[PDB]
């Protein structure tokens, strides 16, 4: 724990609906809406063997703000030889607000359909 | 026909309707068993129109079974689910129009409903 | 013919998401998002023909659905700021795209049906 | 090793669905549904320790999720009577199954994640 | 000074009842309900500035609260069609009336606080 | 009698059932007019049994007008409300048992409904 | 004769509050609370005969309803930890005590129905 | 602003259902649950001319804990010359948790009945 590494107050889990297994090595970039309305690169990384992303931020760097989770669905499908639909699966939301909170972004991937859900815990 | 019940099956892999999918509609009897109500395959549109009439679709518990296994297996894909089952109490508060959407992938399905008040 | 059709549905009430705002944008040469078309969803959650077969050209399109405002108007504070659908249209030639959106306060699903015209 | 796991989520609330009744059924030789297990989802909407690798055998399994009891307690009249997951388990060696169910009053989605131990 | 004030609360969520339509009427000599005020509650679930001590005259008033739409918009099926508050106002001189409402899908409570200016 | 519509009236000031309260039950007509349905006065238990029968109490929008003004003035008290109104849609999804409770105070009142599935 | 009845209701479902635990106590001379009754509500949501006219003596009584576990077991995060009704019973001759509680996650209402015995 | 005095993150509004006016100068005592499950005195203030309570705590002292709000309904009705049912009306809850929040406690009094409500804000 320091300045945005290892704590787990935000986890992204990506699944493959076609294969019925976790979506591994999916590129994704977490952004943060700056006062000048533009997106500041917050976190960068790929999904593990479990199809998850751990310790993206600390309970100190993950402050109140608008976040963009850009999941690279296209490169996942194109690597499997599939011509999909979306350029990327995007998730835009306001974080913590009431107080420090835990977030899980689940994304169910099909080439021509994506399903995104948020699950909130009470820390 | 009056289309008071509509079933639309879609393929989430192809990004097009799921064609020639076997689906059987049933109705729960007094002895808690399933009585054969309807039978039909999905058209070019991936829809099933003319399932039942306005008066034949009486109040009861309906079972819409979509044979997903046969659909995926006839493409060379061994799927997870044997089928997809939609069980719901119909009309209940008088006659209503039902729209059932099914979005399939080998290891996942999603069923939705839209109830119209005529 | 309607080359782009957008349907929005409410998973909570089981009905079309009426009067939802969708702002369509096309990726310009300088990689900026240029306003293409804006509109509200009908009583059927259908955004009937936003564009012509000629206006809707080859390019990366962004369909931004304001779900936050749909939910907030209904007394619900949703998770998402909006729903995004970013795709590449008319790459291989003219095509008929049908975007289906399914909304719940903390979950959304966007599915597509692409077809060869006529 | 936990061969069967069931997760239930609330798409409206954005939280696990708690105390939802799930009843597992194995298919018999005479095409009838024999019971297997019963359970209300944990605070995590999870249902761990349902079966054992020895108890989990070659057959067609049914998973009944009482979505109706869930929505009705919340003051909501849902569309579905329940949600049904019907699948053949361990037809080609023992495997680890995770059944995920995403619920909304008038819509539900079910996905399966299979991994070899 | 604000003569007529309406407050509406959500007993289920524990927060003000926002975007709740209310229409106020006044009984006419011909026993017909004449329009008086019409406004959808704000973030605070409160409704002020509906009248002036001058416009708010003698007669029987009706405060029709559209609780049904409020609950239906949440996907909740309520019991009541609405909530009526029928009362005689300013009979013995002008009075300051606060009309509070507490809503639950199958229950509503309405209380009144009268102040002498 | 069958008791598909019950009305219990309680005194929050006295902690006793509201005895001799006048109540008039109405039913909405096709012309949006309130047609008289039943008219009784609360018992020693503050209740009203024998208002209607399961078959007579058909689907529709019902109005239960509770004469609180008569009740509080008979005690010397100056009440706020002219009455306590209860407007609801009865049956719809088959015959249902209804129990309308009313807690009375000079300047407050609360209605609660207990719907049972027979 | 039933000298103590506890009726618990659900203002969200409009049904009796099923399987609510309530513990009754009687304040001792040292102001400590002695156990009197404990039982979870039935399908009726009512809790009759928690005592006899003999056991139920003069004193300050505490009816504690576990509203938190009721709501959390339904999947709702409520406001209050519990709901406590405290009162002096049979102080001026034995009476018939009826404690009613109406439950909403962030609100509760309690009433008293004191009747002369037999 | 100090150690639980002037900020406004907790109010107690008490109404009279008999008179139809705010229940004026009613006794009410706020407590906080200690580690040994004992009730420690926190605030003792009577309802104003508006039947409200202000000057109870700061955002500083009002910390994650269980709070007991005891309304003396018995003394209010007896002062009026009525023999009420309830010994008191008690509100027991957990405050802040996620983040520091504003809590309004509404109370409606009748000699043999009481209705209590909670209104929680965004901070």
PDB file of N, CA and C in Angstrom, chain A residues 10-94:
ATOM      1  N   UNK A  10     -11.460  -1.772  -5.908  1.00  0.00           N
ATOM      2  CA  UNK A  10     -12.003  -1.803  -7.270  1.00  0.00           C
ATOM      3  C   UNK A  10     -11.403  -3.016  -8.025  1.00  0.00           C
ATOM      4  N   UNK A  11     -12.265  -3.968  -8.459  1.00  0.00           N
ATOM      5  CA  UNK A  11     -11.870  -5.169  -9.215  1.00  0.00           C
ATOM      6  C   UNK A  11     -12.696  -5.267 -10.489  1.00  0.00           C
ATOM      7  N   UNK A  12     -12.060  -5.610 -11.607  1.00  0.00           N
ATOM      8  CA  UNK A  12     -12.736  -5.822 -12.890  1.00  0.00           C
ATOM      9  C   UNK A  12     -12.591  -7.308 -13.188  1.00  0.00           C
ATOM     10  N   UNK A  13     -13.704  -7.979 -13.510  1.00  0.00           N
ATOM     11  CA  UNK A  13     -13.703  -9.398 -13.882  1.00  0.00           C
ATOM     12  C   UNK A  13     -14.359  -9.542 -15.256  1.00  0.00           C
ATOM     13  N   UNK A  14     -13.604 -10.052 -16.227  1.00  0.00           N
ATOM     14  CA  UNK A  14     -14.098 -10.225 -17.582  1.00  0.00           C
ATOM     15  C   UNK A  14     -14.245 -11.715 -17.889  1.00  0.00           C
ATOM     16  N   UNK A  15     -15.407 -12.081 -18.448  1.00  0.00           N
ATOM     17  CA  UNK A  15     -15.772 -13.453 -18.785  1.00  0.00           C
ATOM     18  C   UNK A  15     -16.011 -13.650 -20.269  1.00  0.00           C
ATOM     19  N   UNK A  16     -15.821 -14.885 -20.745  1.00  0.00           N
ATOM     20  CA  UNK A  16     -16.045 -15.248 -22.142  1.00  0.00           C
ATOM     21  C   UNK A  16     -17.294 -16.141 -22.167  1.00  0.00           C
ATOM     22  N   UNK A  17     -18.400 -15.634 -22.755  1.00  0.00           N
ATOM     23  CA  UNK A  17     -19.688 -16.332 -22.854  1.00  0.00           C
ATOM     24  C   UNK A  17     -19.676 -17.447 -23.880  1.00  0.00           C
ATOM     25  N   UNK A  18     -18.826 -17.302 -24.912  1.00  0.00           N
ATOM     26  CA  UNK A  18     -18.640 -18.246 -26.016  1.00  0.00           C
ATOM     27  C   UNK A  18     -17.929 -19.520 -25.529  1.00  0.00           C
ATOM     28  N   UNK A  19     -16.782 -19.337 -24.853  1.00  0.00           N
ATOM     29  CA  UNK A  19     -15.949 -20.423 -24.347  1.00  0.00           C
ATOM     30  C   UNK A  19     -16.297 -20.909 -22.933  1.00  0.00           C
ATOM     31  N   UNK A  20     -16.957 -20.066 -22.129  1.00  0.00           N
ATOM     32  CA  UNK A  20     -17.333 -20.399 -20.756  1.00  0.00           C
ATOM     33  C   UNK A  20     -16.117 -20.600 -19.885  1.00  0.00           C
ATOM     34  N   UNK A  21     -15.300 -19.555 -19.828  1.00  0.00           N
ATOM     35  CA  UNK A  21     -14.031 -19.501 -19.127  1.00  0.00           C
ATOM     36  C   UNK A  21     -13.695 -18.020 -18.898  1.00  0.00           C
ATOM     37  N   UNK A  22     -12.749 -17.670 -17.989  1.00  0.00           N
ATOM     38  CA  UNK A  22     -12.402 -16.249 -17.842  1.00  0.00           C
ATOM     39  C   UNK A  22     -11.654 -15.723 -19.077  1.00  0.00           C
ATOM     40  N   UNK A  23     -11.814 -14.415 -19.339  1.00  0.00           N
ATOM     41  CA  UNK A  23     -11.199 -13.692 -20.448  1.00  0.00           C
ATOM     42  C   UNK A  23      -9.815 -13.195 -20.007  1.00  0.00           C
ATOM     43  N   UNK A  24      -8.773 -13.917 -20.454  1.00  0.00           N
ATOM     44  CA  UNK A  24      -7.376 -13.701 -20.083  1.00  0.00           C
ATOM     45  C   UNK A  24      -6.611 -12.857 -21.128  1.00  0.00           C
ATOM     46  N   UNK A  25      -5.766 -11.939 -20.611  1.00  0.00           N
ATOM     47  CA  UNK A  25      -4.905 -10.981 -21.310  1.00  0.00           C
ATOM     48  C   UNK A  25      -5.699  -9.932 -22.106  1.00  0.00           C
ATOM     49  N   UNK A  26      -6.896  -9.561 -21.598  1.00  0.00           N
ATOM     50  CA  UNK A  26      -7.729  -8.521 -22.200  1.00  0.00           C
ATOM     51  C   UNK A  26      -7.119  -7.216 -21.759  1.00  0.00           C
ATOM     52  N   UNK A  27      -6.746  -6.374 -22.715  1.00  0.00           N
ATOM     53  CA  UNK A  27      -6.192  -5.067 -22.393  1.00  0.00           C
ATOM     54  C   UNK A  27      -7.311  -4.173 -21.850  1.00  0.00           C
ATOM     55  N   UNK A  28      -6.987  -3.301 -20.882  1.00  0.00           N
ATOM     56  CA  UNK A  28      -7.937  -2.343 -20.314  1.00  0.00           C
ATOM     57  C   UNK A  28      -7.277  -1.176 -19.637  1.00  0.00           C
ATOM     58  N   UNK A  29      -7.846   0.012 -19.876  1.00  0.00           N
ATOM     59  CA  UNK A  29      -7.316   1.251 -19.336  1.00  0.00           C
ATOM     60  C   UNK A  29      -8.371   2.063 -18.590  1.00  0.00           C
ATOM     61  N   UNK A  30      -8.110   2.259 -17.292  1.00  0.00           N
ATOM     62  CA  UNK A  30      -8.930   3.013 -16.353  1.00  0.00           C
ATOM     63  C   UNK A  30      -8.516   4.494 -16.430  1.00  0.00           C
ATOM     64  N   UNK A  31      -9.486   5.387 -16.654  1.00  0.00           N
ATOM     65  CA  UNK A  31      -9.267   6.836 -16.757  1.00  0.00           C
ATOM     66  C   UNK A  31      -9.980   7.591 -15.632  1.00  0.00           C
ATOM     67  N   UNK A  32      -9.770   8.910 -15.552  1.00  0.00           N
ATOM     68  CA  UNK A  32     -10.375   9.762 -14.534  1.00  0.00           C
ATOM     69  C   UNK A  32     -10.643  11.139 -15.142  1.00  0.00           C
ATOM     70  N   UNK A  33     -11.916  11.574 -15.142  1.00  0.00           N
ATOM     71  CA  UNK A  33     -12.345  12.850 -15.721  1.00  0.00           C
ATOM     72  C   UNK A  33     -11.756  14.050 -14.973  1.00  0.00           C
ATOM     73  N   UNK A  34     -10.777  14.714 -15.610  1.00  0.00           N
ATOM     74  CA  UNK A  34     -10.115  15.910 -15.094  1.00  0.00           C
ATOM     75  C   UNK A  34     -11.072  17.107 -15.170  1.00  0.00           C
ATOM     76  N   UNK A  35     -10.785  18.182 -14.401  1.00  0.00           N
ATOM     77  CA  UNK A  35     -11.573  19.427 -14.345  1.00  0.00           C
ATOM     78  C   UNK A  35     -11.798  20.057 -15.730  1.00  0.00           C
ATOM     79  N   UNK A  36     -10.896  19.750 -16.682  1.00  0.00           N
ATOM     80  CA  UNK A  36     -10.922  20.195 -18.076  1.00  0.00           C
ATOM     81  C   UNK A  36     -11.678  19.191 -18.971  1.00  0.00           C
ATOM     82  N   UNK A  37     -12.605  18.418 -18.347  1.00  0.00           N
ATOM     83  CA  UNK A  37     -13.492  17.390 -18.918  1.00  0.00           C
ATOM     84  C   UNK A  37     -12.763  16.207 -19.602  1.00  0.00           C
ATOM     85  N   UNK A  38     -11.448  16.327 -19.869  1.00  0.00           N
ATOM     86  CA  UNK A  38     -10.661  15.273 -20.514  1.00  0.00           C
ATOM     87  C   UNK A  38     -10.350  14.127 -19.549  1.00  0.00           C
ATOM     88  N   UNK A  39      -9.928  12.973 -20.105  1.00  0.00           N
ATOM     89  CA  UNK A  39      -9.601  11.753 -19.365  1.00  0.00           C
ATOM     90  C   UNK A  39      -8.111  11.635 -19.080  1.00  0.00           C
ATOM     91  N   UNK A  40      -7.765  11.459 -17.798  1.00  0.00           N
ATOM     92  CA  UNK A  40      -6.382  11.301 -17.344  1.00  0.00           C
ATOM     93  C   UNK A  40      -6.096   9.812 -17.114  1.00  0.00           C
ATOM     94  N   UNK A  41      -5.060   9.233 -17.767  1.00  0.00           N
ATOM     95  CA  UNK A  41      -4.770   7.802 -17.560  1.00  0.00           C
ATOM     96  C   UNK A  41      -4.444   7.466 -16.104  1.00  0.00           C
ATOM     97  N   UNK A  42      -5.412   6.830 -15.430  1.00  0.00           N
ATOM     98  CA  UNK A  42      -5.348   6.421 -14.028  1.00  0.00           C
ATOM     99  C   UNK A  42      -4.572   5.100 -13.889  1.00  0.00           C
ATOM    100  N   UNK A  43      -5.113   3.992 -14.436  1.00  0.00           N
ATOM    101  CA  UNK A  43      -4.494   2.670 -14.364  1.00  0.00           C
ATOM    102  C   UNK A  43      -4.487   1.946 -15.709  1.00  0.00           C
ATOM    103  N   UNK A  44      -3.447   1.137 -15.941  1.00  0.00           N
ATOM    104  CA  UNK A  44      -3.253   0.338 -17.153  1.00  0.00           C
ATOM    105  C   UNK A  44      -2.857  -1.085 -16.761  1.00  0.00           C
ATOM    106  N   UNK A  45      -3.406  -2.074 -17.461  1.00  0.00           N
ATOM    107  CA  UNK A  45      -3.119  -3.476 -17.182  1.00  0.00           C
ATOM    108  C   UNK A  45      -4.001  -4.469 -17.901  1.00  0.00           C
ATOM    109  N   UNK A  46      -3.585  -5.741 -17.896  1.00  0.00           N
ATOM    110  CA  UNK A  46      -4.317  -6.834 -18.533  1.00  0.00           C
ATOM    111  C   UNK A  46      -4.852  -7.842 -17.510  1.00  0.00           C
ATOM    112  N   UNK A  47      -5.885  -8.613 -17.901  1.00  0.00           N
ATOM    113  CA  UNK A  47      -6.532  -9.593 -17.031  1.00  0.00           C
ATOM    114  C   UNK A  47      -5.733 -10.862 -16.863  1.00  0.00           C
ATOM    115  N   UNK A  48      -5.720 -11.353 -15.621  1.00  0.00           N
ATOM    116  CA  UNK A  48      -5.033 -12.554 -15.155  1.00  0.00           C
ATOM    117  C   UNK A  48      -5.672 -13.867 -15.670  1.00  0.00           C
ATOM    118  N   UNK A  49      -5.102 -15.036 -15.250  1.00  0.00           N
ATOM    119  CA  UNK A  49      -5.559 -16.400 -15.575  1.00  0.00           C
ATOM    120  C   UNK A  49      -6.986 -16.653 -15.018  1.00  0.00           C
ATOM    121  N   UNK A  50      -7.377 -15.873 -13.994  1.00  0.00           N
ATOM    122  CA  UNK A  50      -8.678 -15.914 -13.334  1.00  0.00           C
ATOM    123  C   UNK A  50      -9.652 -14.935 -13.997  1.00  0.00           C
ATOM    124  N   UNK A  51      -9.161 -14.207 -15.001  1.00  0.00           N
ATOM    125  CA  UNK A  51      -9.917 -13.216 -15.757  1.00  0.00           C
ATOM    126  C   UNK A  51     -10.269 -11.998 -14.940  1.00  0.00           C
ATOM    127  N   UNK A  52      -9.397 -11.656 -13.973  1.00  0.00           N
ATOM    128  CA  UNK A  52      -9.585 -10.547 -13.038  1.00  0.00           C
ATOM    129  C   UNK A  52      -8.445  -9.529 -13.064  1.00  0.00           C
ATOM    130  N   UNK A  53      -8.651  -8.405 -12.359  1.00  0.00           N
ATOM    131  CA  UNK A  53      -7.651  -7.370 -12.170  1.00  0.00           C
ATOM    132  C   UNK A  53      -7.617  -6.929 -10.711  1.00  0.00           C
ATOM    133  N   UNK A  54      -6.494  -7.250 -10.038  1.00  0.00           N
ATOM    134  CA  UNK A  54      -6.273  -7.015  -8.613  1.00  0.00           C
ATOM    135  C   UNK A  54      -5.312  -5.889  -8.298  1.00  0.00           C
ATOM    136  N   UNK A  55      -5.590  -5.211  -7.181  1.00  0.00           N
ATOM    137  CA  UNK A  55      -4.804  -4.107  -6.644  1.00  0.00           C
ATOM    138  C   UNK A  55      -4.518  -2.996  -7.631  1.00  0.00           C
ATOM    139  N   UNK A  56      -5.557  -2.550  -8.362  1.00  0.00           N
ATOM    140  CA  UNK A  56      -5.456  -1.481  -9.359  1.00  0.00           C
ATOM    141  C   UNK A  56      -5.170  -0.132  -8.711  1.00  0.00           C
ATOM    142  N   UNK A  57      -5.663   0.061  -7.471  1.00  0.00           N
ATOM    143  CA  UNK A  57      -5.539   1.308  -6.713  1.00  0.00           C
ATOM    144  C   UNK A  57      -5.552   1.068  -5.194  1.00  0.00           C
ATOM    145  N   UNK A  58      -5.266   2.126  -4.410  1.00  0.00           N
ATOM    146  CA  UNK A  58      -5.291   2.107  -2.948  1.00  0.00           C
ATOM    147  C   UNK A  58      -6.546   2.819  -2.455  1.00  0.00           C
ATOM    148  N   UNK A  59      -6.856   2.667  -1.158  1.00  0.00           N
ATOM    149  CA  UNK A  59      -7.984   3.329  -0.499  1.00  0.00           C
ATOM    150  C   UNK A  59      -7.664   4.842  -0.326  1.00  0.00           C
ATOM    151  N   UNK A  60      -6.588   5.325  -1.001  1.00  0.00           N
ATOM    152  CA  UNK A  60      -6.117   6.712  -0.958  1.00  0.00           C
ATOM    153  C   UNK A  60      -6.029   7.384  -2.345  1.00  0.00           C
ATOM    154  N   UNK A  61      -5.702   6.621  -3.423  1.00  0.00           N
ATOM    155  CA  UNK A  61      -5.624   7.164  -4.794  1.00  0.00           C
ATOM    156  C   UNK A  61      -7.000   7.149  -5.470  1.00  0.00           C
ATOM    157  N   UNK A  62      -7.822   6.133  -5.146  1.00  0.00           N
ATOM    158  CA  UNK A  62      -9.175   5.957  -5.666  1.00  0.00           C
ATOM    159  C   UNK A  62     -10.129   6.887  -4.918  1.00  0.00           C
ATOM    160  N   UNK A  63     -10.057   8.180  -5.252  1.00  0.00           N
ATOM    161  CA  UNK A  63     -10.878   9.232  -4.646  1.00  0.00           C
ATOM    162  C   UNK A  63     -12.183   9.432  -5.423  1.00  0.00           C
ATOM    163  N   UNK A  64     -13.057  10.331  -4.929  1.00  0.00           N
ATOM    164  CA  UNK A  64     -14.333  10.674  -5.552  1.00  0.00           C
ATOM    165  C   UNK A  64     -14.087  11.270  -6.934  1.00  0.00           C
ATOM    166  N   UNK A  65     -14.728  10.690  -7.944  1.00  0.00           N
ATOM    167  CA  UNK A  65     -14.609  11.160  -9.318  1.00  0.00           C
ATOM    168  C   UNK A  65     -15.282  10.275 -10.341  1.00  0.00           C
ATOM    169  N   UNK A  66     -15.361  10.776 -11.590  1.00  0.00           N
ATOM    170  CA  UNK A  66     -15.935  10.074 -12.746  1.00  0.00           C
ATOM    171  C   UNK A  66     -14.804   9.236 -13.369  1.00  0.00           C
ATOM    172  N   UNK A  67     -15.034   7.913 -13.516  1.00  0.00           N
ATOM    173  CA  UNK A  67     -14.060   6.967 -14.065  1.00  0.00           C
ATOM    174  C   UNK A  67     -14.558   6.327 -15.350  1.00  0.00           C
ATOM    175  N   UNK A  68     -13.623   6.000 -16.254  1.00  0.00           N
ATOM    176  CA  UNK A  68     -13.880   5.329 -17.531  1.00  0.00           C
ATOM    177  C   UNK A  68     -13.074   4.025 -17.535  1.00  0.00           C
ATOM    178  N   UNK A  69     -13.740   2.869 -17.682  1.00  0.00           N
ATOM    179  CA  UNK A  69     -13.073   1.562 -17.756  1.00  0.00           C
ATOM    180  C   UNK A  69     -13.191   1.127 -19.222  1.00  0.00           C
ATOM    181  N   UNK A  70     -12.095   1.238 -19.979  1.00  0.00           N
ATOM    182  CA  UNK A  70     -12.078   0.880 -21.397  1.00  0.00           C
ATOM    183  C   UNK A  70     -11.583  -0.557 -21.534  1.00  0.00           C
ATOM    184  N   UNK A  71     -12.502  -1.526 -21.716  1.00  0.00           N
ATOM    185  CA  UNK A  71     -12.157  -2.947 -21.882  1.00  0.00           C
ATOM    186  C   UNK A  71     -11.992  -3.244 -23.391  1.00  0.00           C
ATOM    187  N   UNK A  72     -10.789  -3.705 -23.811  1.00  0.00           N
ATOM    188  CA  UNK A  72     -10.481  -4.012 -25.211  1.00  0.00           C
ATOM    189  C   UNK A  72     -10.956  -5.405 -25.626  1.00  0.00           C
ATOM    190  N   UNK A  73     -12.251  -5.454 -25.947  1.00  0.00           N
ATOM    191  CA  UNK A  73     -12.975  -6.629 -26.416  1.00  0.00           C
ATOM    192  C   UNK A  73     -12.480  -7.049 -27.807  1.00  0.00           C
ATOM    193  N   UNK A  74     -12.304  -6.070 -28.728  1.00  0.00           N
ATOM    194  CA  UNK A  74     -11.884  -6.261 -30.119  1.00  0.00           C
ATOM    195  C   UNK A  74     -10.629  -7.127 -30.273  1.00  0.00           C
ATOM    196  N   UNK A  75      -9.534  -6.792 -29.556  1.00  0.00           N
ATOM    197  CA  UNK A  75      -8.277  -7.544 -29.620  1.00  0.00           C
ATOM    198  C   UNK A  75      -8.400  -8.960 -29.068  1.00  0.00           C
ATOM    199  N   UNK A  76      -9.305  -9.181 -28.092  1.00  0.00           N
ATOM    200  CA  UNK A  76      -9.578 -10.491 -27.518  1.00  0.00           C
ATOM    201  C   UNK A  76     -10.182 -11.386 -28.599  1.00  0.00           C
ATOM    202  N   UNK A  77     -11.260 -10.922 -29.264  1.00  0.00           N
ATOM    203  CA  UNK A  77     -11.952 -11.678 -30.309  1.00  0.00           C
ATOM    204  C   UNK A  77     -11.134 -11.841 -31.565  1.00  0.00           C
ATOM    205  N   UNK A  78     -10.488 -10.755 -32.040  1.00  0.00           N
ATOM    206  CA  UNK A  78      -9.638 -10.774 -33.237  1.00  0.00           C
ATOM    207  C   UNK A  78      -8.449 -11.735 -33.093  1.00  0.00           C
ATOM    208  N   UNK A  79      -7.976 -11.960 -31.842  1.00  0.00           N
ATOM    209  CA  UNK A  79      -6.883 -12.894 -31.542  1.00  0.00           C
ATOM    210  C   UNK A  79      -7.347 -14.360 -31.657  1.00  0.00           C
ATOM    211  N   UNK A  80      -8.663 -14.605 -31.521  1.00  0.00           N
ATOM    212  CA  UNK A  80      -9.313 -15.918 -31.596  1.00  0.00           C
ATOM    213  C   UNK A  80      -9.843 -16.161 -33.017  1.00  0.00           C
ATOM    214  N   UNK A  81      -9.587 -15.202 -33.906  1.00  0.00           N
ATOM    215  CA  UNK A  81     -10.004 -15.251 -35.302  1.00  0.00           C
ATOM    216  C   UNK A  81     -11.453 -14.879 -35.519  1.00  0.00           C
ATOM    217  N   UNK A  82     -12.026 -14.121 -34.573  1.00  0.00           N
ATOM    218  CA  UNK A  82     -13.416 -13.678 -34.628  1.00  0.00           C
ATOM    219  C   UNK A  82     -13.528 -12.188 -34.971  1.00  0.00           C
ATOM    220  N   UNK A  83     -14.368 -11.880 -35.988  1.00  0.00           N
ATOM    221  CA  UNK A  83     -14.736 -10.534 -36.423  1.00  0.00           C
ATOM    222  C   UNK A  83     -15.901 -10.142 -35.483  1.00  0.00           C
ATOM    223  N   UNK A  84     -15.662  -9.264 -34.471  1.00  0.00           N
ATOM    224  CA  UNK A  84     -16.720  -8.951 -33.500  1.00  0.00           C
ATOM    225  C   UNK A  84     -17.532  -7.706 -33.890  1.00  0.00           C
ATOM    226  N   UNK A  85     -18.081  -6.953 -32.912  1.00  0.00           N
ATOM    227  CA  UNK A  85     -18.868  -5.749 -33.196  1.00  0.00           C
ATOM    228  C   UNK A  85     -18.255  -4.471 -32.615  1.00  0.00           C
ATOM    229  N   UNK A  86     -18.192  -4.387 -31.283  1.00  0.00           N
ATOM    230  CA  UNK A  86     -17.699  -3.233 -30.548  1.00  0.00           C
ATOM    231  C   UNK A  86     -16.214  -3.024 -30.693  1.00  0.00           C
ATOM    232  N   UNK A  87     -15.791  -1.743 -30.773  1.00  0.00           N
ATOM    233  CA  UNK A  87     -14.374  -1.364 -30.811  1.00  0.00           C
ATOM    234  C   UNK A  87     -13.791  -1.685 -29.425  1.00  0.00           C
ATOM    235  N   UNK A  88     -14.642  -1.503 -28.379  1.00  0.00           N
ATOM    236  CA  UNK A  88     -14.337  -1.725 -26.970  1.00  0.00           C
ATOM    237  C   UNK A  88     -15.606  -1.701 -26.123  1.00  0.00           C
ATOM    238  N   UNK A  89     -15.559  -2.330 -24.938  1.00  0.00           N
ATOM    239  CA  UNK A  89     -16.648  -2.296 -23.963  1.00  0.00           C
ATOM    240  C   UNK A  89     -16.246  -1.207 -22.979  1.00  0.00           C
ATOM    241  N   UNK A  90     -17.082  -0.179 -22.807  1.00  0.00           N
ATOM    242  CA  UNK A  90     -16.747   0.917 -21.913  1.00  0.00           C
ATOM    243  C   UNK A  90     -17.672   0.965 -20.713  1.00  0.00           C
ATOM    244  N   UNK A  91     -17.138   1.392 -19.547  1.00  0.00           N
ATOM    245  CA  UNK A  91     -17.887   1.526 -18.285  1.00  0.00           C
ATOM    246  C   UNK A  91     -17.574   2.905 -17.670  1.00  0.00           C
ATOM    247  N   UNK A  92     -18.552   3.833 -17.651  1.00  0.00           N
ATOM    248  CA  UNK A  92     -18.354   5.186 -17.095  1.00  0.00           C
ATOM    249  C   UNK A  92     -19.253   5.385 -15.847  1.00  0.00           C
ATOM    250  N   UNK A  93     -18.658   5.737 -14.678  1.00  0.00           N
ATOM    251  CA  UNK A  93     -19.374   5.843 -13.398  1.00  0.00           C
ATOM    252  C   UNK A  93     -18.748   6.800 -12.391  1.00  0.00           C
ATOM    253  N   UNK A  94     -19.559   7.288 -11.427  1.00  0.00           N
ATOM    254  CA  UNK A  94     -19.102   8.156 -10.335  1.00  0.00           C
ATOM    255  C   UNK A  94     -18.697   7.263  -9.142  1.00  0.00           C
TER     256      UNK A  94
END
